[PDB]
Write an enzyme that holds these catalytic residues in place. Structure first.
Site, PDB file in Angstrom:
ATOM      1  N   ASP A   1       3.833  26.186  24.775  1.00  0.00           N
ATOM      2  CA  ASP A   1       2.745  26.894  25.441  1.00  0.00           C
ATOM      3  C   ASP A   1       1.427  26.159  25.321  1.00  0.00           C
ATOM      4  O   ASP A   1       0.594  26.246  26.228  1.00  0.00           O
ATOM      5  CB  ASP A   1       2.578  28.292  24.821  1.00  0.00           C
ATOM      6  CG  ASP A   1       3.530  29.329  25.407  1.00  0.00           C
ATOM      7  OD1 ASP A   1       4.084  29.135  26.523  1.00  0.00           O
ATOM      8  OD2 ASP A   1       3.683  30.376  24.744  1.00  0.00           O
TER       9      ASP A   1
ATOM     10  N   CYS B   1       4.745  20.981  38.239  1.00  0.00           N
ATOM     11  CA  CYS B   1       4.404  21.863  37.142  1.00  0.00           C
ATOM     12  C   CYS B   1       3.501  22.922  37.738  1.00  0.00           C
ATOM     13  O   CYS B   1       3.848  23.490  38.790  1.00  0.00           O
ATOM     14  CB  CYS B   1       3.836  21.080  35.941  1.00  0.00           C
ATOM     15  SG  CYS B   1       2.526  19.875  36.372  1.00  0.00           S
ATOM     16  N   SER B   2       2.383  23.269  37.134  1.00  0.00           N
ATOM     17  CA  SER B   2       1.543  24.194  37.895  1.00  0.00           C
ATOM     18  C   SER B   2       0.583  23.462  38.851  1.00  0.00           C
ATOM     19  O   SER B   2       0.544  23.767  40.040  1.00  0.00           O
ATOM     20  CB  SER B   2       0.746  25.163  36.983  1.00  0.00           C
ATOM     21  OG  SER B   2       0.075  26.145  37.756  1.00  0.00           O
ATOM     22  N   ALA B   3      -0.161  22.453  38.384  1.00  0.00           N
ATOM     23  CA  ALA B   3      -1.014  21.675  39.304  1.00  0.00           C
ATOM     24  C   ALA B   3      -0.321  20.427  39.844  1.00  0.00           C
ATOM     25  O   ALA B   3      -0.855  19.777  40.773  1.00  0.00           O
ATOM     26  CB  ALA B   3      -2.325  21.298  38.618  1.00  0.00           C
ATOM     27  N   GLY B   4       0.768  19.979  39.246  1.00  0.00           N
ATOM     28  CA  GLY B   4       1.421  18.791  39.728  1.00  0.00           C
ATOM     29  C   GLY B   4       0.761  17.523  39.276  1.00  0.00           C
ATOM     30  O   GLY B   4       0.948  16.474  39.927  1.00  0.00           O
ATOM     31  N   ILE B   5       0.047  17.546  38.128  1.00  0.00           N
ATOM     32  CA  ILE B   5      -0.637  16.346  37.620  1.00  0.00           C
ATOM     33  C   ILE B   5      -0.419  16.085  36.128  1.00  0.00           C
ATOM     34  O   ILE B   5      -0.415  14.927  35.701  1.00  0.00           O
ATOM     35  CB  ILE B   5      -2.136  16.295  37.995  1.00  0.00           C
ATOM     36  CG1 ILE B   5      -2.897  17.480  37.385  1.00  0.00           C
ATOM     37  CG2 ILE B   5      -2.276  16.181  39.494  1.00  0.00           C
ATOM     38  CD1 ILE B   5      -4.414  17.366  37.550  1.00  0.00           C
ATOM     39  N   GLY B   6      -0.241  17.140  35.294  1.00  0.00           N
ATOM     40  CA  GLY B   6      -0.243  16.962  33.817  1.00  0.00           C
ATOM     41  C   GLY B   6       1.148  16.677  33.284  1.00  0.00           C
ATOM     42  O   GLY B   6       1.536  15.531  33.045  1.00  0.00           O
ATOM     43  N   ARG B   7       1.926  17.741  33.092  1.00  0.00           N
ATOM     44  CA  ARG B   7       3.330  17.575  32.718  1.00  0.00           C
ATOM     45  C   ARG B   7       4.046  16.728  33.739  1.00  0.00           C
ATOM     46  O   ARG B   7       4.857  15.872  33.399  1.00  0.00           O
ATOM     47  CB  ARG B   7       4.040  18.920  32.601  1.00  0.00           C
ATOM     48  CG  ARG B   7       3.464  19.747  31.435  1.00  0.00           C
ATOM     49  CD  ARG B   7       4.131  21.078  31.426  1.00  0.00           C
ATOM     50  NE  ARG B   7       3.393  21.969  30.567  1.00  0.00           N
ATOM     51  CZ  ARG B   7       3.715  23.241  30.402  1.00  0.00           C
ATOM     52  NH1 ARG B   7       4.819  23.715  30.993  1.00  0.00           N
ATOM     53  NH2 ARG B   7       2.928  24.014  29.653  1.00  0.00           N
ATOM     54  N   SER B   8       3.754  16.941  35.040  1.00  0.00           N
ATOM     55  CA  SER B   8       4.417  16.143  36.073  1.00  0.00           C
ATOM     56  C   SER B   8       4.046  14.677  35.950  1.00  0.00           C
ATOM     57  O   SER B   8       4.886  13.795  36.176  1.00  0.00           O
ATOM     58  CB  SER B   8       3.965  16.639  37.463  1.00  0.00           C
ATOM     59  OG  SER B   8       4.526  17.897  37.769  1.00  0.00           O
TER      60      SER B   8
END
Ligand SMILES: [Cl-]
Ligand SMILES: [Cl-]
Length: 280
Positions: free
Chosen positions: A181, A215-222
């Site tokens: 989380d 992911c949610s924004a498509g930049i961090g985890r992605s």
């Protein structure tokens, strides 16, 4: 292991934040005019995360071609990825239209739909076999055929049908369900196992379109997934595998989508995943 020594040097120096801010400063800036048009306001989950015009994926139906998604074409690594935000309640039809038109056969999801009581993504795939989804705007049907639920990730077999032509395709949904989380995983072992399972599935086959990652924004985890996967590909190909410079690879990917890797902790974790994955 040169990367392991530089890694230990950065750790000993406590300079992850410094390297990460240099990346931020050096990153490309390209226009995002289409993303910012008034008619696209409700197609973006986050006003501060937009695809560049030059790399955005265009939808082929006739009225509005816009989706918040970018084609990252890593030419030396010989792999392309589509990085996109978590679909919104009004963009799930667009998401699957993009999957269809781009010929993708895998979707990599790196978040849970809700995390810490906040929604990160719409429920864009069916959870029950008998309750298929129909996207009436884009004329697609999506059915859950089966799923393989494991402790740290789930793989779903979906059937996506173009209702206009009645053609069907199998799409694999690779859902990493255990990212913490807050922060990054303490160990990259589970994340690497997941990355290798995606690769082994036949999804990244050059016969298919690019894998879709979100992911949610498509930049961090992605961004972490894309960066680690691309660096492992380069090491498995380059004559000098230790010549892979992770900062340079990340700056290359940032020519195609802004903001990839959102924290110094994500940057350190990416280094750690590549080091550990290279040993594997
Ligand atoms: Cl407009
Ligand atoms: Cl950034």
């Amino acid at each position: 292991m040169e990367m392991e020594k530089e890694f230990e040097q950065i750790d000993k120096s406590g300079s992850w934040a410094a390297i990460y801010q240099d990346i931020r400063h050096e990153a490309s800036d390209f226009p995002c005019r289409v993303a910012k048009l008034p008619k696209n306001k409700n197609r973006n989950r986050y006003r501060d995360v937009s695809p560049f015009d030059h790399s955005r994926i265009k939808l082929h139906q006739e009225d509005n071609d816009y989706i918040n998604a970018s084609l990252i074409k890593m030419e030396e690594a010989q792999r392309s990825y589509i990085l996109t935000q978590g679909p919104l309640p009004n963009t799930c039809g667009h998401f699957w239209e993009m999957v269809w038109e781009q010929k993708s056969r895998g979707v990599v999801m790196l978040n849970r739909v809700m995390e810490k009581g906040s929604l990160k993504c719409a429920q864009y795939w069916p959870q029950k076999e008998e309750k298929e989804m129909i996207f009436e705007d884009t004329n697609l049907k999506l059915t859950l055929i089966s799923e393989d639920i494991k402790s740290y990730y789930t793989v779903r077999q979906l059937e996506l049908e173009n209702l206009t032509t009645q053609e069907t395709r199998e799409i694999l949904h690779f859902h990493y369900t255990t990212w913490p989380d807050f922060g990054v995983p303490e160990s990259p072992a589970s994340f690497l196992n997941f990355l290798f399972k995606v690769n082994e599935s036949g999804s990244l086959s050059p016969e298919h379109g690019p894998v879709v990652v979100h992911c949610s924004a498509g930049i961090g985890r992605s961004g972490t997934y894309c960066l680690a996967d691309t660096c492992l590909l380069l090491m498995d190909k380059r004559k000098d595998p230790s010549s892979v410079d992770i900062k340079k690879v990340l700056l290359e990917m940032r020519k195609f989508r802004m903001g990839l890797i959102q924290t110094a902790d994500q940057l350190r974790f990416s280094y750690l995943a590549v080091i550990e994955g290279a040993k594997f």
